[PDB]
Structure formats: C-alpha cells, structure tokens
Amino acid sequence: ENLYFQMKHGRVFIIKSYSEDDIHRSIKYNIWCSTEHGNKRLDAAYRSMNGKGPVYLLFSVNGSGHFCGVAEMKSAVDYNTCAGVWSQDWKGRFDVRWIFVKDVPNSQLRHIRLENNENKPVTNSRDTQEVPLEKAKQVLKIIASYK
C-alpha cells in the first residue's frame, strides 16, 4: 500500500500551455506566467494558503494527449516584469518548483471527473481549472506511479 496522498491542506490547479517552449523555459528557470485572470486566481490561492499547504500545478500542453509534469507554486505573482519572455507577448511572473517531469497519457487520468466542472474528465480542463482536493489526491497518485 501507498497511503501518502490520501493531508487536508493544499490546492491544485490544471495549467494548460499552448507552447512547448514555455514548458521548457519553466523547467529551466522555475518560473511561470498565466493569463491575467489565471494569475489572479493562482495568486489568491497562494496567498490564502499562507504556507499551511502546497499549491500544486498539473501541467499539460494543449492538444498533446498527456500531462507533462507537476510543479509547486513558490511565490506570489509579480505583475510588473519584463514583457515578451514567453512564446507569445503575458503580464507577470511567479516562482515554481518543478516536482515531476514525466509524460502521463490522458488515458491514465480521463476517468477522474471534476464535480466543480460539470463532472467533465480532469483531462478536459481549461487553464487554471481548480481540482477538488479529493480528486487531486487521485490524480497525484496516478502520476507518481506511472512508468
């Protein structure tokens, strides 16, 4: 048995990227940026957490068929930073720490559905879709165990 993930503090968000370049840059420099509304949502969650638990980011490139890894949010959002550092010319930056870098096919995860998103498969989420914690524990377990 593995009962590690089944912890009652933590918040988990889907991150969708159109760009494989942005993913590589994120892993290289441990930073990320979302849309304006995505940034606001992540920033609110990080600050309300007050270090009592992690904010996890589950990354997937749009259209790729797989998640590509897991990172923890590690700072609030800085909204006034150098423009143009990502593939398309994004307002701001925050720190992350990449945890897993591995491809996990959507087939491994499509059966987990999100009650807060019309019971759609977690694999059908938009950028910064939040994941209920009890579903997030199931997703993290499948990702950590995929080979």
29-53 burial: b if 16+ Cβ within 10 Å, else e: ebbbbbeeebbebbbebbeeeeeee
Q: Which of 4, 7, 9, 18 binds ligand IFZ (CB under 6 A)?
A: 18
Question: In the numeric block, which tokens belong to residue 44?
Answer: 């609110």
Segment near ligand IFZ (CB under 6 A); pick from 28-36, 64-72, 104-112, 139-147? 28-36
130 touches ligand IFZ by CB under 6 A = no
CA distances from 132 to 29, 50, 90, 98 (A): 28, 19, 27, 21
Cβ proximity to ligand IFZ: between 17 and 123 the closer is 17
Contact residues for ligand IFZ (CB under 6 A)?
16-19, 22, 33-35, 38, 86, 90, 127
> Binding site, residues?
16-18, 22, 32-33, 62, 86, 90
